[PDB]
């Protein structure tokens, strides 16, 4: 018999992104080649099958630094991290291949899906 | 020029609630009289003006235990904590006064609004 506030989930995510911008309560740095990205482990796990696996691991859960595979593109990761915190994906002709490869590695199935559909339309 | 995934914010919140149920990465216990509630500080801040103020404080941000005012009803807090993590509010005739008082203390304006409207309709 609950009632539901339609905008609540979006409002929560907006405040989680505000916390990220201000670097409040961030508990991990994701290292992608020469670049560093601060984030909240809980948000990363909530969005990515890879981070969900990493941070449920009894040893990796306590690491403050995670290094991604050297093949991962920093811009692709940046675009996906922005998506995690906003629901918005900056998908462009010049970045789609890097975004799709990063989304496959991060196990973000909905992003992979759409990248596949956008590539298929251009061929 | 971004595209947006409609269900993303709801999917994030569902996984944050799964983390709470499994007690993964919870970093605070909220003590309400004889009862204890484990939660994620980031979610509490994202939902409540009171917790936002508490956890941006340079000393309180590092506390693992927060004790609420003894006038706060544990069931009212439980209902509001469930709302924070799900967007669903278990608002009933028998709990509405406790829910509204707890929402005023926690500074959760949308919940206060609706409690006010539901009480006005019954008078």
């Amino acid at each position: 018999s609950c009632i539901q506030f339609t905008r609540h989930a979006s409002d929560v995510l907006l405040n989680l992104n505000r916390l990220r911008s201000r670097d409040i309560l961030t508990d991990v740095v994701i290292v992608v080649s020469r670049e560093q990205f601060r984030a909240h482990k809980t948000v990363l796990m909530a969005c990515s099958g890879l981070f969900y696996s990493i941070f449920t691991d009894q040893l990796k859960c306590n690491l403050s630094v995670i290094n991604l595979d050297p093949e991962i593109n920093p811009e692709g990761f940046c675009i996906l991290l922005d998506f995690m915190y906003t629901s918005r994906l900056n998908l462009r002709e010049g970045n789609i291949m890097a975004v799709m490869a990063t989304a496959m590695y991060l196990q973000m199935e909905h992003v992979v899906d759409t990248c596949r559909k956008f590539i298929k339309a251009s061929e | 020029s971004c595209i947006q995934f409609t269900r993303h914010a709801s999917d994030v919140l569902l996984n944050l609630n799964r983390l709470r149920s499994r007690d993964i990465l919870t970093d605070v216990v909220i003590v309400v009289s004889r009862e204890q509630f484990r939660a994620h500080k980031t979610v509490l801040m994202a939902c409540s003006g009171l917790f936002y103020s508490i956890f941006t404080d340079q000393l309180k941000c590092n506390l693992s235990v927060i004790n609420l005012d003894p006038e706060i009803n544990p069931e009212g807090f439980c209902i509001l904590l469930d709302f924070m993590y799900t967007s669903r509010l278990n608002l009933r005739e028998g709990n509405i006064m406790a829910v509204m008082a707890t929402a005023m203390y926690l500074q959760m304006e949308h919940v206060v609004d609706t409690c006010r409207k539901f009480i006005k309709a019954s008078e």
Binding site: C2, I3, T6 | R88, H110
Partner: peptide, 4 residues
Amino acid sequence: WVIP
């Protein structure tokens, strides 16, 4: 607010 809605009836979900």
